[PDB]
Symmetry: C6
């Protein structure tokens, strides 16, 4: 189950302050799109109200945004991925001038941001996540029917808006949020593939997502599975390390490599 | 050869309508998410049952084609394949929080979803499907004139809308539905080819199709034959295993490899 | 000459029936487009009247659609080849529930559909077509001035609409129709080339064309010579066999390989 | 150097007008089929004959350029992209001739009417072979830098594709031996995905459509075709072009490497 | 860690305003030339000086971010595609300086005004070289993950390209040693067909246009440029970048592998000078 | 300095006759665009008027078009680079029926047109141009701050319109005009790269530019440095020789190869 502590209740006000304090946007190959902070606040309030209906114990099924919110839109005519970058402009989510809030998960003293759980298909990513990492909230997206779907920690989403709502919303409150998988986004990323058989904007998106979590004191682990050649995975993992607060590589059911940006410094394996 | 409607099928009609109304679904490829009109599937089920009532329950595949039973066969209610992912949004069909309904076909105790019948051209996919699999309903799409077209189990479709209508409609009632083949969709998949000489959205589509069947308690076998190199088929089959409930590989008229997600767990050969 | 037998006259009524009974469309990378059946019927009527005015012995020049019909259009604002597959939908011409009508040409007991006469430039396709296959009607499209143009069996077309009119129109009556060539359609196929250096929709088009002939009891031989590498022709011929009722490979002025789907079964060489 | 108008040319004027009016033609590339205004070609022929009459039959290539003789040089009669559905634009190929083509003595004996492609790498001797070995009656110069051939009285300097077809169909139908050096402005602007041989497939369709356009109007034209292709891939492309033209000439190190001509005595390879 | 405003900076304010008004500039990429609103840069300089005055000369990078000081951060003043005819859009390059450019002591001695490009593969030590060896006065942080450099009082966190140019031209003209870590948000969103070296050709034109923009406004800027390029094509890309900037530094294995600086003493390739 | 001789003053009338006599246009991948001859005439008049106010000694800074003309536009709604060639038409600047005016620069007896100074980055193109070629007017465009910018012969431009104005305007008068560089145009050439890793229209543009100078009796040297592989430069240089009146290749600070079309014939090294 997903148990709501007094620590989570005390973070509600702070979470609302963090969201209102900084206006954020996101961009991919098109034009920068603003994130409606209000929706995340509304989600937190809905989760707290339901938590109150129960004994603080929540079922992942009951906290899905499609059930709690009338509208699940976070992004507020249509632009092509091959338009002039000077007509659309360029946006990256700004960094934190202050020291980021540290966490005990996925690693000790890790800064707020995003961790990428990498590896080839069947390398043990989902296994490593649920057995070793053991998240408080397990977001399930674009993955076939598995044993992890029967878990009361599992929250089934359909859109990118829903992913960010649950990640920012619950992550800000102090929950250890995880996403399995981020394949719906990755496999629909349109554009010319750069060095490593993957679009360059993929690395920019990971940085923008990481900083979005750093700003809202979230500690999120995302399963990032790329359609990349068996030997080109090492290059891509090195490139992802420069774009995320955390990075975990899986090979043959075990953890091959690690990288974490902590209060004790950047730790490699 | 005939398609017989048992009392078991009649008793599932109400449940099928209940599953369809309970969850609103959509589908996305490289464009924008498009909603699926559930009502059309319900209307199809009612038309099949009405005809089964007039006949002895012994129905001919020719008489149950949607173009004949329905006035309009549309299930989806103009965007380029190279449009910003943030302007269209991303959609994946949500997972099942509950345990999926098990089936005896194509394998014992297999969960509801999709099975991909893979193999090179002339590897014996169509032969394995009809002789070894023995499906109740055989959907024939984008295939040249063969002996399987003269079968009373054969239902000849033209559109993707029709495929989903027969698959969800009859599959929900408990019928063992099969599609030979899904080639018109695969060969019209526009986009930049990823690792393995195939567009990445192909794997996302298989997962979205699988989850669509998992949600509506369907057990469907689709023969998937995409344009891929003779040696690159092993990589693609491994990737498809991570995107479907079932996977069957054909080589020299026989079954080379198998993967099934059952109540007894994931079984490899 | 092109001689009209009583057997052809007796098929006129059956041809109008077949054409009215099933509404057909065609799709490539755009949106599905309906085929106006009336135009084919109008063409048959104009050919029969001219055959009745002359001695039954017609000249290919006199039966060209541009001469017999006021308008040659078969297809009834503008869509790009890179448009979302979900916005246009997917269409494949439906298969035949009944047994297809057999023919003695290009092979004994062959089912109605299309035969692809394949080979590199100067492999002997056009020689094999005119000397070994001996067609009744020879449609000449996208080819330079050759000896075959002076033949009384030769009918010179300009559009794809005209090709289908003569193929379906005369083919349905029992004539052995051949197209030399289909290069104006192949070389103008816009899209990203799949495995084998050729667009995947090419194989779907051959199946759709074949089934169009299977439905209207036609036996057509099309010379198909797409821009493909000298060594990649074997792979492409292999994929084409899985997309057509007949397949003939030319090399060094002679027949290299054959495949025919007959009443006695699929025959390979 | 001069362009002389014989009685044979004068006697063909009526026949040329008949050939043009008899068959309506179009052209297509990656967009939609575009009709060719036959009237413009007839108007050009009339202007050339009138000037030939004022002179002694002896004409200067400079004086017979379409931009000088016609007020409007347009042959093709809102805007479509090269990546549009083939089914929405339709497909057009210029129809073949049911009758025997009109044979010529140039570039080869008994060669049928149509187009000949003068191929070869850059500096292989295409322009040299064209002017020294071929000896054309009319030399169309297009998209080529300043050379000795521009000072020739046979040289007619054009700017558009419309102008090329006007001079090729107009003068070729009358019986003149017309040549184009070169067709690089069309080839280098051919938009589309490059097929096998590092060149767009529609290139081969265009050569056939151009050939048949000349076959129908009994024109004997030699076009120097030099597309951007790899040094070793030229052999493959030349073989493919042979299947798309009435004539084909390959140049290598200033000399003629290979030949192909479709004649009344049959197809002749070297 | 702090950003100190000297009398030298105060004396440059007028000079900077004149430089901006004297020459009208634009920028182009694959679309239509877009004009740069000089007024916004002047307004930013005035806001920085006014705040420097309220504080004791010393300023915090957080307080000088354009989003905080200006009501609108737009520098570029309907929508054109990256694949439009070059003749329908025309071509624009920022013009060169007819006079001798203002020399600087940073990033190299006697260097001309313009842009310096700090190259290297990922984890080659670009950010380390920038902060330890180069020591910039103002550190612009853009599209980079949470690092130790973000806690620095020299760090100014931006989000747009408009903001980058405002801080670079605005503070750089006054005499500050401005650095950008990273320029990746721009590089990773460069739409177009990749040329030789697995990178769009307009990338090199943009570096030259950015360099000349700084040469005209007497700025000395160091931009860290991380290219999505294969391990073996980095040498080719660097050679090409050297021909497009006033300064270029290559990083490899935590150290400086190669340098190029256009100084008053001439073009110096791989000099004996610690940064 | 830039000195105006009596020879230049005597050419003013002839330059107007040349510009008025032939209407010209330019095309790239879009539609043909007319060149407004009047603007070039206006520029010549402004240069001569200023040369008069001076002692015949002009500063390159004072003769820049942005300073002398109110509007710098030469080309007189918006078309895509991937539009049908038949809808835009094709334009090449026409050749000269007469013998071209000869020059003593960059080579003895060279015909009027364009010379391409080629070579890898840092091969010594700019060095060869200013030390060995010694041009009368050095147009500086899209190049970084160098010693050549402080030269009184240097004229700094921003647009392609400005380049052609100075090249045609001053070149027609007899000045030895050079451009360092033509990179702003070359690095913004949109389209599919042909053989040699460069767009085919690049070679057509060089010929069109060369013929534009041949028609207006100009002798211009352009630094052409396109993004091409280290080994592919030899192929491209050979192709450029077939597209220009002059061609110079640079390697390791020295001149590797030369080609000039003179009154004494085509001279190779
Ligand atoms: N093709 C295969 N054959 C055998 N076992 C496999 C195969 N693919 C995966 N496995 C098993 O599944 C485990 C990985 O499961 P999982 O965590 O779901 O992988 P991932 O999330 O990376 O796709 C492996 O350690 C192995 O035991
Ligand atoms: N090229 C070939 N040569 C010989 N036999 C072939 C060939 N291609 C297919 N076959 C025969 O057809 C069988 C496969 O039929 P089928 O099930 O229709 O294949 P698929 O559906 O995979 O295309 C093979 O087992 C073999 O007996
Ligand atoms: N490159 C060539 N060299 C020599 N003869 C050739 C060549 N190409 C074709 N031929 C001749 O033409 C014949 C093939 O003719 P044809 O059927 O028209 O070819 P295609 O396969 O292109 O339709 C060959 O048998 C040979 O006699
Ligand atoms: N790179 C070169 N080196 C030496 N001579 C050359 C070179 N390129 C061309 N030539 C000379 O020019 C002749 C070819 O001239 P030309 O007919 O104009 O060629 P093309 O029209 O095929 O481009 C060759 O036979 C040779 O004498
Ligand atoms: N894969 C790695 N394994 C070990 N150390 C690494 C790795 N990647 C980077 N480092 C360390 O980080 C340093 C580079 O840090 P940084 O300046 O942030 O690089 P950059 O800015 O070029 O991405 C290296 O000198 C090395 O000590
Ligand atoms: N990577 C380098 N290493 C050393 N010297 C170099 C390098 N690149 C250029 N140079 C020097 O600069 C000279 C070339 O200068 P320049 O004319 O500006 O070249 P270009 O115009 O072709 O880019 C060379 O002759 C050499 O002395
Ligand atoms: Ca998994
Ligand atoms: Ca099959
Ligand atoms: Ca042939
Ligand atoms: Ca030539
Ligand atoms: Ca860094
Ligand atoms: Ca230079």
């Amino acid at each position: 189950p997903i148990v709501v502590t007094q620590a989570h209740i005390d973070r509600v006000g702070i979470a609302a302050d963090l969201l209102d304090a900084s206006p954020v946007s996101l961009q991919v190959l098109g034009r920068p799109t603003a994130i409606n902070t209000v929706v995340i606040k509304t989600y937190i309030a809905a989760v707290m109200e339901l938590a109150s209906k129960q004994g603080g114990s929540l079922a992942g099924v009951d906290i899905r945004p499609s059930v709690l919110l009338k509208d699940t839109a976070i992004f507020t005519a249509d632009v092509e991925s091959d338009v002039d970058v000077l007509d659309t402009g360029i946006y990256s989510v700004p960094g934190l001038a202050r020291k980021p809030v540290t966490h005990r998960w996925p690693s000790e003293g890790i800064y707020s941001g995003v961790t990428a759980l990498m590896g080839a298909t069947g390398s043990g990513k989902s296994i490593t996540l649920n057995e070793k990492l053991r998240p408080d909230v397990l977001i399930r997206w674009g993955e076939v029917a598995e044993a992890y779907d029967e878990l009361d920690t599992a929250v089934h989403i359909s859109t990118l808006d829903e992913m960010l709502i649950v990640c920012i919303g619950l992550g800000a409150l102090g929950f250890n949020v995880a996403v399995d998988s981020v394949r719906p986004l990755l496999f629909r990323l349109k554009g010319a593939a750069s060095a490593g058989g993957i679009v360059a904007v993929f690395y920019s998106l990971l940085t923008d997502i990481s900083n979005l979590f750093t700003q809202y004191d979230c500690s999120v682990v995302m399963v990032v599975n790329p359609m990349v050649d068996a030997e080109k995975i090492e290059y891509v993992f090195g490139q992802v390390m420069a774009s995320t607060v955390g990075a975990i590589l899986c090979a043959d059911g075990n953890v091959s490599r690690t990288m974490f940006r902590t209060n004790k410094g950047r730790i490699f394996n």
